[PDB]
Amino acid sequence: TGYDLSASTFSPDGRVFQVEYAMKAVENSSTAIGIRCKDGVVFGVEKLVLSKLYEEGSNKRLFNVDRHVGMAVAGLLADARSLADIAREEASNFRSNFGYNIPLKHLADRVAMYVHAYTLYSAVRPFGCSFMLGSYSVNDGAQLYMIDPSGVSYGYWGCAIGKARQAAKTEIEKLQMKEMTCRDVVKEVAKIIYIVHDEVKDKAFELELSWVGEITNGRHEIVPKDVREEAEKYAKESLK
Amino acid sequence: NQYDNDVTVWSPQGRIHQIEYAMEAVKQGSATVGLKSKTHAVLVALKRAQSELAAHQKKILHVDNHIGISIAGLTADARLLCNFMRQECLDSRFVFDRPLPVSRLVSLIGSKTQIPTQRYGRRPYGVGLLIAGYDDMGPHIFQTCPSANYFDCRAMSIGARSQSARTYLERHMSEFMECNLNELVKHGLRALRETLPAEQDLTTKNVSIGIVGKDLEFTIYDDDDVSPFLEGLEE
Amino acid sequence: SIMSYNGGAVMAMKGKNCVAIAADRRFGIQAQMVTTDFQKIFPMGDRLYIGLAGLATDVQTVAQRLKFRLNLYELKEGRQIKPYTLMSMVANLLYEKRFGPYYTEPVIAGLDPKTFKPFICSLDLIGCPMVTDDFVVSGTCTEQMYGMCESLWEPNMDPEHLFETISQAMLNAVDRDAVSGMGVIVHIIEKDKITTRTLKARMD
Amino acid sequence: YDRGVNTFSPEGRLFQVEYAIEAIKLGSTAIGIQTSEGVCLAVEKRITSPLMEPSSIEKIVEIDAHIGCAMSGLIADAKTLIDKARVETQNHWFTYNETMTVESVTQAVSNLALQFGEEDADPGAMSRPFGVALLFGGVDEKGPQLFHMDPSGTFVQCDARAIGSASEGAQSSLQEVYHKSMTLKEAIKSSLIILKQVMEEKLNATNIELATVQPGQNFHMFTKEELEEVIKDI
Amino acid sequence: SRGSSAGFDRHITIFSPEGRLYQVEYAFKAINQGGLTSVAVRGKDCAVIVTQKKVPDKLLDSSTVTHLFKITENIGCVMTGMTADSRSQVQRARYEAANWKYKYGYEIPVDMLCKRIADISQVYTQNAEMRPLGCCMILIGIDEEQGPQVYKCDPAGYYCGFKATAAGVKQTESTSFLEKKVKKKFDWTFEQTVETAITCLSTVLSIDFKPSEIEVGVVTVENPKFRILTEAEIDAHLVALAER
Amino acid sequence: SYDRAITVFSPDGHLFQVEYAQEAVKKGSTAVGVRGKDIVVLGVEKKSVAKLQDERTVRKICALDDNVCMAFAGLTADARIVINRARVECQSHRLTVEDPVTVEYITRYIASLKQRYTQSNGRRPFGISALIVGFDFDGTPRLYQTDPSGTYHAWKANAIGRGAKSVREFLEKNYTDEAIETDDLTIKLVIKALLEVVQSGGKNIELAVMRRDQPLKILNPEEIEKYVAEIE
Amino acid sequence: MSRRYDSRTTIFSPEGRLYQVEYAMEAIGHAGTCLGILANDGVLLAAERRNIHKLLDEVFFSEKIYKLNEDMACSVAGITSDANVLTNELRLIAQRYLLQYQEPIPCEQLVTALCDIKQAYTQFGGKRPFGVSLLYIGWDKHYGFQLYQSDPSGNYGGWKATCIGNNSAAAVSMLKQDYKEGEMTLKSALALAIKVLNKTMDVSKLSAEKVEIATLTRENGKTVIRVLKQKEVEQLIKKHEEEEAK
Amino acid sequence: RGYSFSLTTFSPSGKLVQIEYALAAVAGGAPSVGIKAANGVVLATEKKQKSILYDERSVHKVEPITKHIGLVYSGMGPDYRVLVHRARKLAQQYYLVYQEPIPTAQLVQRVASVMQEYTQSGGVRPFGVSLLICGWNEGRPYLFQSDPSGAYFAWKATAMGKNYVNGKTFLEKRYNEDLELEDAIHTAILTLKESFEGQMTEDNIEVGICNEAGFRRLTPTEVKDYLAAIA
C-alpha cells in the first residue's frame, strides 16, 4: 500500500518492488540466448513479427556496441536503443581515453552501473531491458556477460533471457559446449531456439544469429547468408 | 489507481500506464498511410475539418528536400518534433554537405522521445509519425510512437481506425514494388476511405499528399494538385 | 604608482599603556588640492581606531566595509572586538581581492579590551598581517616616516610624550612630501579617555 | 491535487488543456468574419455596472497595421500573447523588412501554448496553459485572412468563427448567414444581428465595439460617432 | 507508540512517533534477501574471509561469480547483500580509495575507507529523494601500524570493527559459535584461523563444505597483498577438518 | 529551486487560487472613490483603531508618483510588494520617457505583475485589489481598479473591500451630473457613501483629495468632522 | 519531485486565509508574553520568560530581547529557533542601509525591509513560514520614537501600547483603558506595564526572574538601550505591590 | 535535483510535528550526562555493546571538534557524524578568518543554525541528535545543549537518553557550586549507575573532560582509575 509506488522505497520485507516490476517487463519479452565455445561466442534471438507490414530486419535486437563487442537485448526495445547508444559512448570513451579495444569485463561494468543508477532515485524509473554482452579476443577468449534491470552481471557458458529461460537453460546443459567449434555451435544454437519456441500466443519470428570468434578475426558480425541458411536448415532437419 | 498518474511508475505487470495513455492520443486523431515502391515513397494524410466553415489542419509538413512527415497526434506537439527534425536535416547539410540518411534521422527521434519517457515530471510526446524519405539505400517508410520505439516498414497506417487501413495494405503488398508514380498514390487513397464511414468521401479539400522519389524532391500537393490523382479512382 | 594619486599619510606609534594614531587632512588629485577636511582615521569603537592611506577611493570603500563587518561581529558576539582579531579581518578583507586588490595600506591601533594591552599593526595591498612592538606607517611618504619614528620612539612612554613624539613625527615627515600636508589630525587612546587634537601645520 | 499538469487522461488528452477549453465558455462573445475585401471583428464588452467607463475596455487590439485581433475567456492571460504577438510581428519587419503574414503570427503565439510544464524548465516557464482563445484578422498578399487559436496550440484557418460565452448559439446562426462574396457592410450588419441577440444587455454605441481592416486601408476601429450610424441601420 | 506510524514515515525516511526510521530498518532485511552468509575472522597475523559460494546451475561461470572483490592491492572486500547494490559501492569504494591516493598520496587505511563509505550512506538516510543501499560491506586488510583490520558497514551508516564478523542469512547463530572459540583464546596462525573459520560455517549449516562450495580470501603480515585461495589450496585446509 | 504548479484549472474551469485570492479582498477595509471635475477623492474606513494605533503608518491610501495615487483593500502584506514594484516602474518610465507616467501606464504594469504570478511555477496569487487614481496630462481625472486576477478597468465611482456591494448601491443612485460640481459636494458624496458601512461611527473615516497639479492631500479628523456636521 | 509528499504551504484556504500563517500565530499564541508602551520619554519592552530552572546558566543577554542596531532593538514571541534566522537578517539589512546611505536606518525602513523576507516565504518557494512575530523599538531623525509589531504574515503597524504572545488579548484591553495619549511618562509607563502583567501572569507574585524589562531612551544625541537588572526590576515590583494596599 | 519542498510544517495545534518526534529519538538513545562545575566540564556517555567481538578502539562516541571544544551525543548515531564533520569545518572557517579558536557560544550558534537549515530547506529531515558541546574560553567553561529544533540552551548539569527525567532529578539533589572537576567525574558516573544496568567497566563507559588543558578523551586505563569510586 504505497510502498511500491517509487524506486526509493523498501517494502516491509526489504524488497524494492519498482525494480522487481521492471524485471517482469523482461519476463514478457521474447526469448534470446547466447553461448560460448572454444572458438568464440554465438548469439541468437527470437525477433517476433507483429505484422507482415514490417520490413525484414526491422526492430533489430542485435546491436553492435564496438567492433569486437556484440549485444543482444530482451525487454522494452525503447530503453534498449538508449543502452546500445550509451554502451557505444563507453566503448568510444575507452577508445579515446585508453586507445585500444575495451575489454568485455570492463564494458559490462560501466553499463551495469548506469542501469543501476536509475533504481536509486524517485525521479527516474528502472530500465525494463535485460541484455547480454559477448565478445572474443585472442588474449582473452570467449566471454559472455548478462546484465539485468537491477544491474547484476554474471558470466555464463550459456544463458536464456526473456520469456523462456528455465526451458532454454535446461536444453543448453545437455550439450557440452567447451570443446566444440563455433561452426558446429551455430547449428546447435538454431536447434535450441526452435525447440524452445512454441507457437500459441505469438505467430512468426525471424531467426537472428551472430559471429564473434576465431572465424571473424575478432570483429563481431551477423551470420552471413550461406552459413545462416546452412545453419537454419540443419535445425529444421533435426526438428523431427 | 495509484499507478496511473505518473510516467516513471511501473505496474505489477511491468506496464507503464502513462506511455500507454500517450498511445491513445494517436488513436484520437485522423488516420494517415504511406508506402514505398522501389523508387517513390508517398505519404497520404487525411486533413480533418473542425467544421464545414473552418478550414483543415495541416497533417503533412516539410522536413528536408528528400524527407517529409505525416503527423497524427497533438498538432502543436508535433511542431516540436518537426522543428527538431528540420534542425537535424539542416545540420547534416551544413556539416557533411549531404542529405541526411532517413535511418539516422529516425534514430535521433528515438533519442529525443526517449528522455521524457524516462524522467519524472515530464510527459511523452503524444505524436505518432510516418517519415518518408529517399537516400542511397532507397526509399524508406518509418513509423514512430510515443513510446519512442521506431520501426522500419513497407507500409503502415496510424491514427483513428487505422487497423482496417493496415489490413488493406497487406493484401496488395506484393504489388507495391512495381507501381509507378500514379498507381502508388492510388493504393494509399484507397486505404483512407476504408478508415472513414461510407457517409463521407474523399475530396480535394480534406486530403493532402506528399511524394518523394529517385529524381523527385519531396513536394506537398494541396488541393488543385490533388484532383488529378483523385480522378480515375472508383469509390 | 596608483597609490600616489591622492597621496596621504598614516602613522601609529605604541606607548606603554596607550597608543596614538595620526594622519594628515589633505585631499587632492595629483598636483591639485581640493579640500582639507578629508578623514583618514575612522573609529572602530571605544579605544580602537584604524587608519587608511593610498587611493582615496579605497580609503572610504574599505572603511565602509569594516564598519559593515565590525557591527555584524559586535552584534553576534557579546563582547567588543579585540584589536588582534580586527587585524585578521582586514587581512581577510584585502586578501579576497588578491587579483583585483584595493589600493590602501591599513594601519590598526588600539587597546586590548581585556585590561591595558596595547596593539598596533600594518598591512599591505594583499593584506599580510604585520605586528610590531614599536610603530607602523603607511603612505607615499612612508620613507620619511621611518627615519622620524626610528629616532624618536622609545620602549615605554606616557600619553603626554606619545603626542609630542607623533606630532613632530608627522609634521616634519609631511613637510618633505609634496602630495601630503594641509594639517594633521592626531588621536590619543588611553585607558581612561581619548584625546583628539588637530594640529596647526603649514598650508602648502 | 494528485495529477500533474502533463498527465494524460486515459482518453489520451491532457487534463490542463482539457480544462482550459472549459474556461473559454465563461468569456465574452467575439465574432470574426472574413471577406474578400476585408475582415470584420465584433465583441461584447460586458459592462458590469453603470459607474464603469466603457472606453477603458478594449477587447479588440491591433497586433500590427495589417493585422487585428480579438479575445475571449480570461482577459488577463490575453495580454501575455498580445504583447508577444506584437514583438514577433516587429521582429519580422525588422529582420526581413516586410509585414509578417497572419499565418506566421499564429505560428508564433501557438508555439507558446504547449510550453507549460513543471520540471526541467526555466523561471520563465508557465505552470498552466493559457485560458484565452484568440482570433487574428488581417490582410496580406494572400488577401484577407482570419484564424482561430485555442489553448491546445492548434491554429486553424477559418472564414468566420464565434468564441466566448455562447459559441454554439452564434456558430449555429453564423454559418447560415455567411455566404461567399458577401461584402463588409453586409457582414457588419449580419455580425451585429447575430451579436445583438446572443448578448443580454441591449445594443448601444458604447455597449459593444467593432473593428475592420481593408487591403488598401490600415486596421480601423469605428468610433462612437460612426457606430451610432451603424446601429441605426440594424 | 511501539510501532505506531504517522503519515509518510514508512515510505520515505522521516521520524515516526517512536523516533525510528522504518526505511533503514527494511534495508537490514535487504541483506537477508541475498540468500547466503559470510564470515571474516581476524587472527593474530592474518584476517581470513570465508564466503558461502552458491552456483546452482552448471551453465553459470564460477570464475565470474565472486563476492570477494579487490578494493586496492592491500585491502580486501566481501559484499553480503543485494548483488546490484554490492557492485555499486565497490565501484564507489574504488573511486574513494583512488581519490584518497590522488589527494593524500598514500594508500587509504581500512578504517578510513569504511568511514567515507558509511558517511555516504548517511546522505541517503536524510535526503527523502532516494533510498539507502541494501548491501552490507565487510572489509579486511592490514595497516602497517595496527596490524590486521576487519571492519563492517551497515546501510544505516554505522561502521564498527569486529574481531570476528558474520553477515547474511545466518548471523546471530553464526556469532554464537564465534563467541565459543574466541573466548577460549587459541593461538591463531594462518592454518589455525582458516580451520576455525571454515568450521564456524559448517557447524551452523551442517555441510562440511566441498572445495568448490567456498572461496577464501586471505591477508597476512608476510603476504600484505590480498589473495584468493585456489581450489587446491582450499582442499589442503579441508582435510584438517577430518582431524580435530 | 522549487518549480511546481500552484494555480491550476478545475473541472469547472475556475481557478481556485485566483478565486480564493479574491476572497481575501472580500474581507478588506472598505475603500471608495469618486471622480469630480478638477478634483478626485479617495476614502477608506478603518474599524481596527483602538486609539492605541499610530494612524500614519497604517494608512492604506498611498502615492505611486506625483501625478498618481492609489488605495487598496485586501491583505496588506501583499500590497507593500505591488506598491514597491509599481514605484520602481514609475521612475524607470521617466528614465525611459522624459515625460511623466500616464495613469494608464502604471495600471498596466500593476496588472502584468498579477498575471505573471498567476501562471508562474511555484507562486501564489496576490490577495489585493488596488484602486489607482491620478491626473493624466491635460488635467483629466482618472480612476482605475485592479483585480487579483490581473484585470484592470476604469470607473467614475467605485468601491472595493468589505461591504463594497452596499456602497455601490448608494453610489449608483446618487452619482449624477448635477453632483460633483463643487469640491465640497464631491467630498460630501464620499462621506455619504460610507454611511452604509458606518457602524454608528465615522470618526475613523480617512479621506484624500487631488486637484490639478497639486499633490495628494489627506484631511485630518478635524477637517472631515466639519463635513460630517452637515447632514440634515 | 513526488508531489504526494508536498503539503502545499503557499496555497490559500477556501476562505482565503493562508493556513501556515494562521497556525504560526497559534505557535506565537503560546509563546512568551511581550508588551511595549510608548511614553513621552522612552519606550519599554517587558518580556516574560518561559524557560526557568535552577540549572539554567543565563550566560548571554536578556534572553529573547535582542539588539538589531545601535538605535533599535527587538523582542521575540514565537518559535525560539526561527528567531535567530530573522535576527541575523535584520542585522544584515540595517548594515546594508548604513553601507550605502551612511546614516542610521529609520524604523519604518527596517521593518518594511524584513517583511519583504516574510513575504517571499509565504508567497513562494514552498518552504514553511517563520513562526516568529516581533516587537520593534527605536528612534530616528524624523518621526521620533517608534513601536512596531510585525507578524508571521509580514503585517506590521505603529502602536502606542501593544502586547504579543500568551494572553496578548487580555493585556491590550487593559492598556486601552489605562494608557493616556501624551500623558504617559517612562516613570508612569513602567508602573503601568507591571500592573498589566501581574494580572496576565500565569504564575502569581511576579518574580524578578520571570518578567524582564528593556527600555530605550535617547540622551545626548545617542540612543541608550538598557536592560533593567533584576535589582531594579524587583524594586519597581515592590513599589507597585505597596500601591495595591497602601 | 531533489525535493525543494519543506518536510516540516506547522500542525493545527501550532507545534512542529517533525521536531517533536526528533526529540523522541534522543530520549531512547545512549544515556549521556554532562556537568559544568568549577574549572572544567565533564561528559560521560554509556557505550553499551551487544557482544565481546566489538572492538572498542574503533568507535568512540565522545569526539573533539577542536582542541578547546568537545562533543557527545544522545540520539541517532550516524547523524552525529554529519554535524561533527560540519562543526569541524565551522571551527576552521572561523579560525581562518579571525585567526583564533572559535568560542563555544559562537560555535553552538552556527551549529544550531545548521540544524535550523534542515527544519526549513526542502527534502531533508531534521537531525536525530541532541548535542552537548563542552568548551573552555577566556577562563570560563561552557556547557551548551543543542537539540534538533536548533534552540540551544546553557546548562549547569543535564542528562539525556534513557531516564533523562530521572537523570536531572538526581543532578539537582547532588550538583552544587565549589564542585571540583574531580567530584564532577564522580557525580557524572554515579548518575549513569542509576541509569545503566549491570557492571560498568572501562569499555562500558566513555568519559571526557574539557578544561584549561584542552579537551581530551580519557583512555580506558584512566577511566578504570575513576571506576574505583575514588575520584
Coordinates of C-alpha atoms in Angstrom, one line a residue, chain D residues 25-233:
Chain D
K25 CA -17.1 29.1 -22.1
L26 CA -17.1 31.8 -19.4
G27 CA -15.6 34.5 -21.7
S28 CA -17.3 37.2 -23.8
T29 CA -18.8 36.6 -27.2
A30 CA -16.4 37.5 -30.1
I31 CA -17.4 37.1 -33.7
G32 CA -14.9 37.3 -36.6
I33 CA -15.9 37.2 -40.2
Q34 CA -13.7 37.1 -43.4
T35 CA -14.5 38.8 -46.7
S36 CA -12.5 39.1 -49.9
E37 CA -12.5 42.8 -49.3
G38 CA -11.5 42.7 -45.6
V39 CA -12.1 41.2 -42.2
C40 CA -14.8 42.3 -39.6
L41 CA -14.4 41.9 -35.9
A42 CA -17.1 42.4 -33.2
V43 CA -17.1 41.6 -29.5
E44 CA -19.3 42.3 -26.5
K45 CA -17.8 44.4 -23.7
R46 CA -19.9 43.0 -20.8
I47 CA -20.3 46.2 -18.7
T48 CA -21.0 45.1 -15.2
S49 CA -22.2 48.4 -13.7
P50 CA -23.4 51.9 -14.7
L51 CA -20.4 53.5 -13.0
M52 CA -17.9 51.6 -15.2
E53 CA -16.4 53.5 -18.1
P54 CA -16.9 51.7 -21.4
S55 CA -14.0 53.4 -23.2
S56 CA -11.4 51.7 -21.0
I57 CA -12.4 48.2 -22.0
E58 CA -10.8 47.3 -25.3
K59 CA -11.2 43.6 -26.3
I60 CA -10.0 44.2 -29.9
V61 CA -6.3 45.1 -30.1
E62 CA -4.2 45.9 -33.1
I63 CA -1.3 43.4 -33.5
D64 CA 0.1 45.3 -36.4
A65 CA -1.0 47.8 -39.1
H66 CA -2.2 44.9 -41.3
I67 CA -3.4 42.6 -38.5
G68 CA -6.2 42.9 -36.0
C69 CA -7.1 40.6 -33.1
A70 CA -9.9 39.6 -30.7
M71 CA -10.0 37.8 -27.4
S72 CA -12.4 35.8 -25.2
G73 CA -12.2 34.0 -21.9
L74 CA -9.7 35.3 -19.4
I75 CA -8.6 38.8 -20.5
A76 CA -5.6 38.7 -18.1
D77 CA -4.0 35.8 -20.0
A78 CA -4.5 37.5 -23.3
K79 CA -2.0 40.3 -22.6
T80 CA 0.9 37.9 -22.5
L81 CA 0.1 36.7 -26.0
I82 CA -0.8 40.1 -27.5
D83 CA 2.4 41.6 -26.2
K84 CA 4.3 38.6 -27.6
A85 CA 2.5 38.7 -30.9
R86 CA 3.4 42.4 -31.4
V87 CA 7.1 41.7 -30.8
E88 CA 7.1 38.8 -33.3
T89 CA 5.5 41.0 -35.9
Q90 CA 8.1 43.7 -35.4
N91 CA 10.9 41.2 -35.2
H92 CA 9.9 40.1 -38.7
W93 CA 9.6 43.6 -40.1
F94 CA 13.0 44.4 -38.6
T95 CA 14.8 41.3 -39.9
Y96 CA 13.2 40.6 -43.3
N97 CA 11.9 44.1 -43.9
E98 CA 8.3 43.0 -44.7
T99 CA 5.0 42.7 -42.9
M100 CA 4.6 39.3 -41.3
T101 CA 1.7 37.4 -42.8
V102 CA -1.2 36.4 -40.5
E103 CA -0.1 32.8 -40.9
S104 CA 3.3 33.3 -39.3
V105 CA 1.8 35.3 -36.4
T106 CA -0.3 32.4 -35.3
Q107 CA 2.7 30.0 -35.5
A108 CA 4.5 32.4 -33.2
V109 CA 1.8 32.5 -30.5
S110 CA 0.7 28.9 -31.0
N111 CA 4.3 27.7 -30.1
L112 CA 3.8 29.2 -26.6
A113 CA 0.6 27.3 -25.9
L114 CA 2.2 24.0 -25.0
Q115 CA 5.3 25.5 -23.4
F116 CA 3.7 25.0 -20.0
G117 CA 5.4 22.5 -17.7
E118 CA 6.9 22.0 -14.2
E119 CA 10.2 20.1 -14.1
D120 CA 13.1 20.7 -16.5
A121 CA 12.0 24.2 -17.2
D122 CA 13.3 27.8 -16.7
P123 CA 12.0 30.6 -14.3
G124 CA 10.0 31.9 -17.3
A125 CA 8.1 28.7 -17.9
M126 CA 4.4 28.5 -17.1
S127 CA 2.5 26.2 -14.7
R128 CA -0.8 26.2 -16.7
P129 CA -1.9 26.7 -20.2
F130 CA -3.5 29.9 -21.4
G131 CA -7.2 30.3 -20.8
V132 CA -7.7 32.6 -23.7
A133 CA -8.8 32.0 -27.3
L134 CA -7.6 34.5 -30.0
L135 CA -8.9 35.4 -33.4
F136 CA -6.4 37.1 -35.7
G137 CA -7.9 39.0 -38.6
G138 CA -5.6 40.6 -41.2
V139 CA -4.7 41.3 -44.8
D140 CA -1.6 40.2 -46.6
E141 CA -0.5 39.5 -50.2
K142 CA -2.7 36.4 -49.9
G143 CA -5.8 38.5 -49.2
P144 CA -7.8 39.0 -46.0
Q145 CA -7.4 36.1 -43.6
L146 CA -8.9 35.1 -40.3
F147 CA -7.5 32.4 -37.9
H148 CA -8.5 30.7 -34.7
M149 CA -6.4 29.7 -31.7
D150 CA -7.3 27.6 -28.7
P151 CA -5.2 26.6 -25.6
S152 CA -4.2 23.4 -27.3
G153 CA -1.9 25.4 -29.7
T154 CA -3.9 24.4 -32.8
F155 CA -4.2 27.3 -35.2
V156 CA -7.0 26.8 -37.8
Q157 CA -7.7 28.9 -40.9
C158 CA -11.4 30.0 -40.9
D159 CA -13.9 32.0 -42.9
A160 CA -15.6 33.0 -39.7
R161 CA -15.8 32.0 -36.1
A162 CA -17.6 32.6 -32.8
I163 CA -16.0 32.3 -29.4
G164 CA -16.8 33.3 -25.8
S165 CA -19.8 32.7 -23.6
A166 CA -22.0 31.3 -26.4
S167 CA -20.1 29.8 -29.3
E168 CA -22.9 27.3 -30.1
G169 CA -25.7 29.7 -30.4
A170 CA -23.6 32.0 -32.6
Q171 CA -21.9 29.3 -34.7
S172 CA -25.4 27.8 -35.5
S173 CA -26.7 31.1 -37.0
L174 CA -23.4 32.3 -38.3
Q175 CA -22.7 29.5 -40.9
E176 CA -26.1 30.2 -42.3
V177 CA -26.0 33.9 -42.9
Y178 CA -22.4 33.9 -44.2
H179 CA -22.4 33.3 -48.0
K180 CA -19.4 33.6 -50.2
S181 CA -18.7 37.0 -51.7
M182 CA -20.8 38.9 -49.1
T183 CA -19.0 42.2 -48.5
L184 CA -18.0 44.1 -45.4
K185 CA -21.0 46.4 -44.9
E186 CA -23.3 43.4 -45.3
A187 CA -21.1 41.4 -42.9
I188 CA -21.1 44.1 -40.3
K189 CA -24.9 44.1 -40.2
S190 CA -25.0 40.2 -40.1
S191 CA -22.4 40.4 -37.4
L192 CA -24.5 42.7 -35.2
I193 CA -27.7 40.9 -36.0
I194 CA -26.1 37.7 -34.6
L195 CA -24.4 39.6 -31.8
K196 CA -27.4 41.6 -30.7
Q197 CA -29.5 38.5 -30.0
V198 CA -26.8 36.4 -28.3
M199 CA -25.9 39.0 -25.7
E200 CA -28.1 40.1 -22.7
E201 CA -27.8 43.9 -22.4
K202 CA -29.3 45.9 -25.2
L203 CA -27.2 47.1 -28.2
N204 CA -25.7 50.5 -27.6
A205 CA -22.9 52.6 -29.2
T206 CA -20.7 52.2 -26.1
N207 CA -22.0 48.7 -25.1
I208 CA -20.0 46.9 -27.8
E209 CA -17.1 47.6 -30.1
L210 CA -16.4 46.9 -33.8
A211 CA -13.3 46.7 -35.9
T212 CA -12.4 46.2 -39.6
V213 CA -9.4 46.0 -41.9
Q214 CA -9.1 46.5 -45.7
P215 CA -6.3 45.8 -48.2
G216 CA -5.8 49.4 -49.1
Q217 CA -6.6 50.8 -45.6
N218 CA -5.0 50.2 -42.2
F219 CA -6.7 48.4 -39.4
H220 CA -9.5 50.7 -38.2
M221 CA -11.9 50.7 -35.2
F222 CA -15.2 52.5 -35.6
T223 CA -15.6 55.4 -33.1
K224 CA -18.9 56.1 -31.2
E225 CA -19.9 58.7 -33.8
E226 CA -19.6 56.1 -36.6
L227 CA -21.2 53.3 -34.6
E228 CA -24.3 55.4 -33.9
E229 CA -25.0 55.4 -37.7
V230 CA -24.3 51.7 -37.9
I231 CA -26.6 50.7 -35.1
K232 CA -29.2 52.9 -36.7
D233 CA -29.4 50.5 -39.7

